[PDB]
Amino acid sequence: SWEVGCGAPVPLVKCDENSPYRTITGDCNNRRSPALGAANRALARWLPAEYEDGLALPFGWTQRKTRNGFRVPLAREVSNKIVGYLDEEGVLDQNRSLLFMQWGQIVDHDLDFAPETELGSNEHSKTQCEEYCIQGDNCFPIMFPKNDPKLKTQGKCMPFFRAGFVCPTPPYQSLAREQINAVTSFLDASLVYGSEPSLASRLRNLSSPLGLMAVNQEAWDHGLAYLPFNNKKPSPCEFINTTARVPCFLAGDFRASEQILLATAHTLLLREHNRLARELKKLNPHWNGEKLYQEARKILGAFIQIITFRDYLPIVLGSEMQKWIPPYQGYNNSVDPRISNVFTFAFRFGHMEVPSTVSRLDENYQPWGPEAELPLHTLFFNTWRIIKDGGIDPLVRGLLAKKSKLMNQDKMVTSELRNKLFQPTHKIHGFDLAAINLQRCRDHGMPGYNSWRGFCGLSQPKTLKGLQTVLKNKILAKKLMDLYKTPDNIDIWIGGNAEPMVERGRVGPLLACLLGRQFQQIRDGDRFWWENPGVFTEKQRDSLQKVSFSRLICDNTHITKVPLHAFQANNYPHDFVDCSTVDKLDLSPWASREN
């Protein structure tokens, strides 16, 4: 009965019908429907949005009004009373290297992004949010509770601006607000090449038709490449250190410089792209720039896919892996390949895997220099510590030698992220990723915790006793009940993350289900999934199956020693073997002697 289209974001979709490369927009993956999985469209709704007023406004927006008869606790309150902790000893994951946490972020940014909106940009109605803290249109501030310490030092609130939505940038009285996903839904490496043709292009090297991605000009890393600097000012990276004056990096995904280890991962990837273009050229001089750039991009996307589905999802979904991602039966166009709104919140389980420090290690994996270990918070949008303090080898060593933080019901998000988050357009290292996650759950009109348990076919606790049984925690349940008066009111981000982990996984039932389904739809609905018969040849596919995060490092850093399995906890020198011994990526199946 209802509509096919509404939406400001429908630019020309002219599909090149038998092309052998995905678009940069994600468009034309699906021929039955061109737009699916494309960048710049509304996130899919697995369940109808749930807003205070059924359309656009978030729960907690109007003070008088309730949710299921009760007030929604302030985001920062929930964060203070449930999310935080002070003791970092004993929080590290004994089976998960720090790369486990990082990859999850790399994959997350390849799949989905719902950036804040600006209509009062360049105008202090935006900093009117931080300063005066008045709720208004897209300014929806995170107000501090009564005993909050930050009240004494940071004002009445933490500024927060609502996510972009379809069809307009301001008014909404006719249909339920759907937020926008600005990147492509396919595990396609869009964080390396962009999701927009405009950016996709600015990143490439058009000077030499070698198929190289444009590298940094002002600095080099022991010869190896750095991403170009986003010559945008003012720059947040410059801001954390106006003496160092080192801008943020320019990448396919606008978030790359958020934290130093993410920027580190982007670098290995850009590096891998140029290493691929080179060996391909040596192997095919007849091949042109577009051909080199496209076949490399195709290879890198295949690499992100294999590592994710073969090395990363099994140990996140443990026992549930099979229940949700069974054998790849082949490409199926009838599958919705879009990212659901809830997944962007569910994937955040990663915020509880981030540890409070980052280490730089030397060739002997030992604290590198006097300040070897730094507090995570000093590294937000910190590019100077890479350029003027060691390169990425020390950080890559740390990612492998160190561990991820383990999710812990009593110790959920480190204060580096809960009290010390640095946000752009703000000057302070005083934000809260958890309070933010919760204000955003609401901003996106997310339905409560039980609707999602119901959705996944799980029990819906209606009492305190019911929750303790589900969370297998008496104390967490009491606090949650004391705050959300009903399990029905619990925000999905915190409810999903409070559940005990499934065996040989790292997220609980509700999350294994929500995550599991998305990644299945991600694989099954991609015409260009690397093992969809016809996108690569077996000689090619059989060469792909060899890839290891290990190899990526050996080929892109100066580091001799790497573990077999990069995601499990590994200790040097015992679990560390020789780069010379790890299987390499044999690109011969890509040699085309047809001139």
Ligand X SMILES: *[C@@H]1O[C@H](CO)[C@@H](O[C@@H]2O[C@H](CO)[C@@H](O)[C@H](O)[C@H]2NC(C)=O)[C@H](O)[C@H]1NC(C)=O
Ligand Y SMILES: O=C1O[C@H]([C@@H](O)CO)C(O)=C1O
CB of 384 to ligand X, least distance (A): 4
Stretch that binds ligand HEM, among 88-96, 111-119, 394-402, 466-474 (CB under 6 A): 111-119
Residue 198 contacts which entry, Ca ion, ligand Y, ligand X, none (Cβ below 5-8 A, type-dependent): none
Binding status of residue 424 toward ligand Y by CB under 6 A:
yes
109 is catalytic: yes
Binding status of residue 212 toward ligand X by CB under 6 A:
yes
Question: How many CB atoms sit inside 10 A of residue 519's CB?
Answer: 23
Count residues near ligand X (CB under 6 A).
12
Does residue 540 contact residue 589 with C-beta atoms inside 8 Å? yes
Does residue 125 contact residue 141 with C-beta atoms inside 8 Å? no
Query: Does 286 count as an annotated binding residue?
Result: no
Question: How many CB atoms sit inside 10 A of residue 580's CB?
Answer: 8
Query: Does 108 count as an annotated binding residue?
Result: yes
Q: Which is nearer to ligand HEM, 296 or 514 (CB)?
A: 514
CB of 494 to ligand HEM, least distance (A): 14
Among 323, 319, 316, 324, CA closest to 347? 316
Among 59, 113, 309, 331, binds ligand HEM (CB under 6 A): 113
Kindly report the backbone phi and psi dihedral angles of residue 429, in degrees, each rounded to the nearest multiple of 5, phi listed first. -105, 60
- Residues 61-100 as x/- pattern, contact with ligand NAG by CB under 6 A: ----------------------------------x-----
Check residue 86 and report its DSSP letter.
S
Binding status of residue 215 toward ligand X by CB under 6 A:
yes
Count residues near ligand NAG (CB under 6 A).
6
Q: Please state the three-class secondary structure of 157-200 as a single string.
A: EECCECECECCCCCCCCCCCCCEEECCCCCCCCHHHHCCCHHHH
Question: What's the rounded Cα separation, in Å, for the pair 425 and 142?
Answer: 16
Give ∠ CA 278-279-282 in degrees, rounded to 5.
Answer: 90
Question: What's the rounded Cα separation, in Å, for the pair 345 and 490?
Answer: 14
Binding status of residue 277 toward ligand X by CB under 6 A:
no
CB of 277 to ligand X, least distance (A): 10
Residue given tokens 């943020």 in the structure block: 248
Stretch that binds ligand X, among 113-121, 191-199, 203-211, 585-593 (CB under 6 A): 203-211
Stretch that binds ligand X, among 20-28, 68-76, 212-220, 500-508 (CB under 6 A): 212-220
Residue 288 contacts which entry, ligand NAG, ligand X, Ca ion, none (Cβ below 5-8 A, type-dependent): none
CB of 544 to Ca ion, least distance (A): 19
Give ∠ CA 361-364-367 in degrees, rounded to 5.
Answer: 35
Stretch that binds ligand HEM, among 74-82, 99-107, 228-236, 389-397 (CB under 6 A): 99-107
Q: Which is nearer to ligand Y, 114 or 325 (CB)?
A: 114
CB of 551 to ligand NAG, least distance (A): 19
Question: What's the rounded Cα separation, in Å, for the pair 562 and 573?
Answer: 9
Among 127, 205, 288, 332, binds ligand NAG (CB under 6 A): 332
Binding status of residue 352 toward ligand HEM by CB under 6 A:
no
Binding status of residue 188 toward ligand Y by CB under 6 A:
no
Among 494, 530, 536, 528, CA closest to 511? 494
Residue given tokens 């920062």 in the structure block: 76
Binding status of residue 568 toward ligand NAG by CB under 6 A:
yes
Give me the half-sphere count of Cα atoms (radius 13 Å) on the Cβ side of residue 223. Answer: 3
Residues 531-590 within binding reach of ligand HEM (CB under 6 A): none
Residues 228-267 within binding reach of ligand Y (CB under 6 A): 254-255, 258
Question: Which conformational region is residue 501 in: left (phi greater than 0), alpha (psi within -120 to 50 degrees), or beta?
Answer: beta
CB of 251 to ligand Y, least distance (A): 11
CB of 481 to ligand HEM, least distance (A): 26
CB of 198 to ligand Y, least distance (A): 18
Q: What are the DSSP calls for 400-459, one per residue?
A: HHSEEEPP-SSS-S-HHHHT-EE-TT---EEE-HHHHHHHHHHHTT---HHHHHHHTT--
Binding status of residue 110 toward Ca ion by CB under 5 A:
yes
Binding status of residue 243 toward ligand X by CB under 6 A:
yes
Token code pair at residue 446: 């997310």
Give ∠ CA 152-157-162 in degrees, rounded to 5.
Answer: 165
> For the chain, how big is the Rg over CA atoms in Å?
23
Q: Which residues of this protein are in contact with ligand NAG, per CB under 6 A? A: 95, 315, 332, 334-335, 568
Q: Which residues of this protein are in contact with ligand X, per CB under 6 A? A: 205, 207-208, 210, 212, 214-215, 241, 243-244, 384, 388
Q: Which residues are annotated as a binding site for heme b?
A: 108, 258, 351
Q: Which residues of this protein are in contact with ligand HEM, per CB under 6 A? A: 101, 104-105, 108, 112-114, 258-259, 344, 347-348, 350-351, 353-354, 380, 417, 433, 436, 440
Q: Which residues of this protein are in contact with Ca ion, per CB under 5 A? A: 110, 184, 186, 188, 190
Catalytic residues, by residue number, are 109
